């Protein structure tokens, strides 16, 4: 669901487009997980003084 300029409309997606979207979503999820892990490691290492 994305707006074409005014109102919302259900855009169509093909097989290749759906596969590319799934791949991009998985990549973004993995990147966010790695970033969260790095942030947690930094916080645990930077908690003394």
């Amino acid at each position: 669901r994305i707006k074409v300029g005014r109102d919302y409309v259900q855009k169509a997606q093909t097989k290749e487009q759906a596969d590319f979207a799934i791949e991009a979503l998985a990549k973004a999820t993995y990147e966010r997980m790695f970033r969260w892990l790095v942030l947690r490691i930094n916080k645990a290492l930077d908690k003394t003084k």
């Binding site: 005014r6 109102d7 919302y8 409309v9 259900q10």
Partner: protein, 47 residues
């Protein structure tokens, strides 16, 4: 001509945007009927 347009183009362009919005939804049609043209209550015209 494009800088002036006409009244017919406004309704055609304005109505086009309205019809395009209803197609992207679930219309719930409600048919309204009038019994008679004499504004009388209770009387009905079969024709």
């Amino acid at each position: 001509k494009g800088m002036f347009r006409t009244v017919g183009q406004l309704y055609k362009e304005q109505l086009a945007k309205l019809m395009a919005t209803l197609r992207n939804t679930n219309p719930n049609f409600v048919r309204c009927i009038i019994p008679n043209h004499e504004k009388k209550a209770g009387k009905l015209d079969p024709h």
